[PDB]
Write a protein that binds this ligand. Structure first.
Ligand code: MG
Ligand code: NA
Length: 203
């Protein structure tokens, strides 16, 4: 028994497949896995102590400080996650072999439920694993002193004095990821932008 239930938006895999118990083991592993990662502070989704509201406050500050901004969003993010790349990223930090083994088994089970298309939206593990997946991407743009960068799930905005969207698109391609070309916004200083549903104005 499992049709569908719109959750945040749509999807076309996972459903009342996930209903409890298996949720507990996934929720327990998620809490265990949070102790292995400190994601860069420019990432605001699925992390205790952070929220979309924080990203909006930072965006409203950063927009006054750069000549350009680029707002974009990853297309079909969770279905697009490469499992082999995700498991290589996990093993670099989860050096507890028993915990890594349990995580790997569940990820492979979740991927099968997703019909081998990335991670299912109904698994409690998928959100934190999406942050693992983009951690090196996030740090690459975070640690650049000449730009600012904010991400909430698949939604990103970059503030810079030189346009970098070609580099963004390429770094995403290294992860198997693409932008939703329809929702991409470039702006010059003085322009407003919609980010996470909020209009952010210069000054
Ligand atoms: Mg998207
Ligand atoms: Na930066």
């Amino acid at each position: 028994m499992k049709k569908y239930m719109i959750k945040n938006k749509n999807k076309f895999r996972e459903v009342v497949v996930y209903e409890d118990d298996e949720l507990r083991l996934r929720k327990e592993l998620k809490e265990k896995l949070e102790k292995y990662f400190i994601f860069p502070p420019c990432v605001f989704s699925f992390i205790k102590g952070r929220s979309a509201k924080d990203a909006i406050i930072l965006a409203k500050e950063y927009i006054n400080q750069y000549d350009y901004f680029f707002k974009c969003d990853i297309k079909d993010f969770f279905p697009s996650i490469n499992i082999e790349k995700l498991l290589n990223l996990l093993r670099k930090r989860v050096n507890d072999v028993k915990f890594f083994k349990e995580l790997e088994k569940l990820i492979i089970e979740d991927n099968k439920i997703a019909d081998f298309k990335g991670l299912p939206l109904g698994s409690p593990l998928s959100p934190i694993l999406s942050n693992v997946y983009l951690e090196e991407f996030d740090n690459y743009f975070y640690k650049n002193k000449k730009i600012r960068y904010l991400r909430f799930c698949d939604d990103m905005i970059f503030f810079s004095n030189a346009n970098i969207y070609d580099e963004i698109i390429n770094k995403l391609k290294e992860l198997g990821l693409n932008l939703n070309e329809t929702k991409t916004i470039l702006g010059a200083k003085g322009d407003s932008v919609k980010f996470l549903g909020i209009i952010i104005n210069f000054k």
